[PDB]
Symmetry: C2
Subunit: 97 residues, 2 copies
């Protein structure tokens, strides 16, 4: 958690969805799990700005490790999670029990 | 307002702009450079605008964005290329040969 990616969360009738803006990270390097109700989204984003940093005239993009945690309702079925990314948005879908 | 974050690097032969534009296909990001000013513009939709009341957390920014970056006179607008991966658009702007 040296940066805190934005995550929206919705509870539909029969599932939750979390949508995490994680640009610049392959969805396979993002770990999504639920442990005792806590949905965590964790990984480490690398950034070009850590390489030849002095050649940057601006560095706005955050990166490094992240670890987002959400205490989702007990209805979230922790054995149902899927996560798939497109264009740096990770969409995590979790059925309700 | 969504102000997508950008880093900009000056390499020996090129400037490189890296923009975090998650949730947009790269082909939908308009990149233009005119008068030494590199512009990125586009629009992102968000799921949060649909059935907003079912969201228990909303923080992702979306809607239109347009940022402009004046670059050194060395940058050559005509040579720009851009490629996107995982929501990051990397724009490469070559430098003009020396006068």
């Amino acid at each position: 958690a040296q940066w805190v990616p934005r995550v929206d969360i919705k509870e539909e009738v029969n599932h939750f969805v979390l949508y995490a803006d994680l640009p610049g990270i392959d969805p396979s390097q993002i770990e999504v799990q639920m442990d005792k109700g806590i949905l965590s989204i964790r990984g480490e984003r690398k950034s070009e700005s850590s390489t030849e940093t002095e050649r940057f005239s601006r560095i706005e993009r955050r990166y490094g490790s992240f670890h987002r945690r959400f205490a989702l309702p007990d209805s979230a079925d922790a054995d149902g999670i899927t996560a798939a990314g497109r264009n740096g948005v990770l969409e995590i879908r979790i059925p309700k029990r």
